[PDB]
């Protein structure tokens, strides 16, 4: 399952990234807990546009 | 057409008809262990033969169309 991370993870990626994860990991943990969202149109595109325009950069994480 | 007589397929695959009645067939005993059989015996078994006139009526019953 390709998923888009609403936050950061140790081995996965940053908020806004998309990664392939095992389906159980995605469905039972990330999706219900809110750590990530399904990589669909009307969700992935909206999140990416909002992150690039309203967010536009790491919130002090890089520094 | 409701009741067309069915041919006997296992007989069709072994019998053949000549133009004026006789039945052609392939001789037996040339399918299997062959080293012991004499050469002239095998040569005669190769060539095809005709059945005795006593079976022709039954065969004509078995092959209603052919």
């Amino acid at each position: 399952m390709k998923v888009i991370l609403k936050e950061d993870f140790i081995n996965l990626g940053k908020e806004g990234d998309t990664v392939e994860v095992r389906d159980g990991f995605a469905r039972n943990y990330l999706l219900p807990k809110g750590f990530a969202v399904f990589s669909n149109k009307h969700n992935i595109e909206i999140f990416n546009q909002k992150r690039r325009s309203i967010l536009k950069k790491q919130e002090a994480k890089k520094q | 057409m409701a009741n067309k007589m069915k041919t006997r397929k296992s007989a069709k695959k072994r019998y053949s008809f000549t133009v004026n009645g006789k039945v052609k067939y392939k001789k037996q005993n040339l399918r299997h262990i062959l080293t012991k059989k004499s050469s002239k015996r095998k040569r005669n078994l190769r060539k095809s033969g005709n059945l005795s006139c006593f079976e022709v009526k039954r065969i004509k019953t078995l092959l209603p169309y052919g």
């Binding site: 399952m1 389906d23 469905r27 219900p32 809110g34 399904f38 669909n40 | -």
Partner: protein, 91 residues
Amino acid sequence: ARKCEITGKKTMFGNNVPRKGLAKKKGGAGQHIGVKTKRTFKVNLINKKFFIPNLGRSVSIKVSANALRSISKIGLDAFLKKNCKKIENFL
């Protein structure tokens, strides 16, 4: 029944066919069918819980592993819409 509540999959009835002998594609003279019996192939339903943030609560549905896979692929709302069912029919 053993029925996927989304797609409508149900168990499928068929035969039980034993075979004796060795297939020709393995050098054997062939195979022979034995005594066929009756049998059933069963869907593997799962009584899954989907947490829906949209109303902040979990809904339990009988779905097959195939439907679970498809939900993971497409998204639960879209899949329900495609099979013309609505989440409120559950609960």
